[PDB]
Amino acid sequence: DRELAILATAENLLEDRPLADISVDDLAKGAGISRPTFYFYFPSKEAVLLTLLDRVVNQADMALQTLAENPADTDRENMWRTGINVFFETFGSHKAVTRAGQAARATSVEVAELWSTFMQKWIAYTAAVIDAERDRGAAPRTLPAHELATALNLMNERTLFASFAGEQPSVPEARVLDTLVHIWVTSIYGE
Amino acid sequence: DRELAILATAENLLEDRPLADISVDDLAKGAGISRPTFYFYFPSKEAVLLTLLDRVVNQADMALQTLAENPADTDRENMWRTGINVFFETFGSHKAVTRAGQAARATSVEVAELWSTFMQKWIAYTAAVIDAERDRGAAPRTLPAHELATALNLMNERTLFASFAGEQPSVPEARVLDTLVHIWVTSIYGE
Numbered sequence: 001d002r003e004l005a006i007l008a009t010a011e012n013l014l015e016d017r018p019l020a021d022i023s024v025d026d027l028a029k030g031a032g033i034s035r036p037t038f039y040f041y042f043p044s045k046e047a048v049l050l051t052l053l054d055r056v057v058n059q060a061d062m063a064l065q066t067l068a069e070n071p072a073d074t075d076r077e078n079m080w081r082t083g084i085n086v087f088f089e090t091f092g093s094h095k096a097v098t099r100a101g102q103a104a105r106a107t108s109v110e111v112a113e114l115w116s117t118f119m120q121k122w123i124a125y126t127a128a129v130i131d132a133e134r135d136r137g138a139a140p141r142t143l144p145a146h147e148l149a150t151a152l153n154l155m156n157e158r159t160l161f162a163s164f165a166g167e168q169p170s171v172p173e174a175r176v177l178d179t180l181v182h183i184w185v186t187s188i189y190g191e
Numbered sequence: 192d193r194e195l196a197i198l199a200t201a202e203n204l205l206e207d208r209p210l211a212d213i214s215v216d217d218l219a220k221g222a223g224i225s226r227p228t229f230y231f232y233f234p235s236k237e238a239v240l241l242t243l244l245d246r247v248v249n250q251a252d253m254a255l256q257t258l259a260e261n262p263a264d265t266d267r268e269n270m271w272r273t274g275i276n277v278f279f280e281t282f283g284s285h286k287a288v289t290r291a292g293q294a295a296r297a298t299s300v301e302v303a304e305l306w307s308t309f310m311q312k313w314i315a316y317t318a319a320v321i322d323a324e325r326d327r328g329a330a331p332r333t334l335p336a337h338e339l340a341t342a343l344n345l346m347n348e349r350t351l352f353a354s355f356a357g358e359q360p361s362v363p364e365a366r367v368l369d370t371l372v373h374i375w376v377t378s379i380y381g382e
């Protein structure tokens with residue numbers, strides 16, 4: 001409630017400036033509570049970012065679970081597009097949290113461990129699906145599935161986040177999805 | 192001379208700890224000069240990292256120029272392997288400078304601009320070679336060459352550096368080259 005108000009205030013301020021330029025007072029003021037009352041709900045501004053990232057990451061994760069149980073009925077190219085799109089839409093809707101979350105990996109053990117855990121989970125799932133495609137005779141046994149999954153997942157992380165941040169260089173946001181699907185599909189189904 | 196001694200001292204200390212844990216006195220002591228004498232050669236420890244990164248980046252760049260003028264006489268798979276390998280060997284030999292250089296992108300305008308400039312140059316060259324391969328009828332016109340180049344280059348950056356840092360997750364250093372060549376070759380020559 002006042003917890004939601006701190007989270008919403010943090011997301012809003014992270015649209016105009018970095019975490020280093022937001023005080024606890026900036027978050028308290030924003031949620032319409034005192035500094036001490038803020039500290040009842042969170043030990044630090046760093047813990048606020050950690051909670052926002054955790055919510056975004058879990059939304060993407062739950063969305064990928066929903067997709068896995070209920071596969072789209074279409075060509076394998078569009079199936080994978082649907083999969084990459086969970087990440088494009090979810091993080092695309094939380095650019096400020098995403099950008100700051102990734103910055104905070106350099107400086108926060110918990111942010112690095114949180115991201116690391118979900119990346120291992122998304123790679124393990126990518127690799128399971130690639131091996132399935134190999135078992136049903138649809139993809140050739142080229143690279144170790146788990147190595148291929150790791151590199152594709154690291155590509156998406158870097159490429160999605162460069163696009164969202166408008167970095168130079170980057171693929172424009174409106175071309176990035178098709179860019180990643182081409183490389184996933186060719187690298188998974190070619191020899 | 193005493194300039195080289197500061198650079199060598201910085202590279203050495205960046206093997207055991209981050210830049211934030213190295214003082215100017217740590218670099219002066221190391222090069223066997225006073226603090227004031229250090230400041231004659233460099234305005235800050237941050238400028239030392241910038242000079243090391245600039246040297247590594249220019250070595251990779253000059254090595255890729257040498258390759259471009261003197262192409263290996265082999266299959267296209269091995270040609271590209273030779274190309275990715277400039278980056279694998281060059282940065283692979285300067286892991287500590289590479290790791291710290293990438294950290295310093297978040298916190299230094301000059302490090303971000305230096306890296307940004309060379310990435311645009313390496314993407315422009317990748318894209319020129321892809322278009323050549325399209326013109327000589329060897330690769331299909333799939334994705335815009337420059338978008339494909341950008342994503343592949345961002346993949347290599349993230350994947351090479353995760354491997355070098357031993358991050359979880361990452362491809363092991365001894366499997367990363369073959370991993371990237373498979374994805375480059377399939378994504379450049381498949382449809």
Ligand SMILES: O=S(=O)(NCC#Cc1ccc(S(=O)(=O)NCCC(F)(F)F)cc1)c1ccccc1
Pocket residue numbers: 067068071072076079080081082083084085087088119122123125126129152153154155156157158160
């Ligand atoms: O698509 S499916 O429905 N299920 C397969 C899948 C998947 C998947 C996994 C990871 C990423 S990822 O690398 O983009 N996310 C890592 C986090 C970040 F975004 F990079 F930051 C993209 C897609 C399908 C089922 C069966 C057959 C084909 C596809």
Ligand SMILES: O=S(=O)(NCC#Cc1ccc(S(=O)(=O)NCCC(F)(F)F)cc1)c1ccccc1
Pocket residue numbers: 258259262263267270271272273274275276278279310313314316317320343344345346347348349351
């Ligand atoms: O290989 S060639 O000799 N010349 C083509 C090339 C190339 C090239 C460009 C960039 C990268 S990159 O993306 O790895 N570097 C970006 C920086 C970092 F490492 F990622 F950090 C790897 C390889 C050839 C000629 C003609 C026909 C085929 C190949």
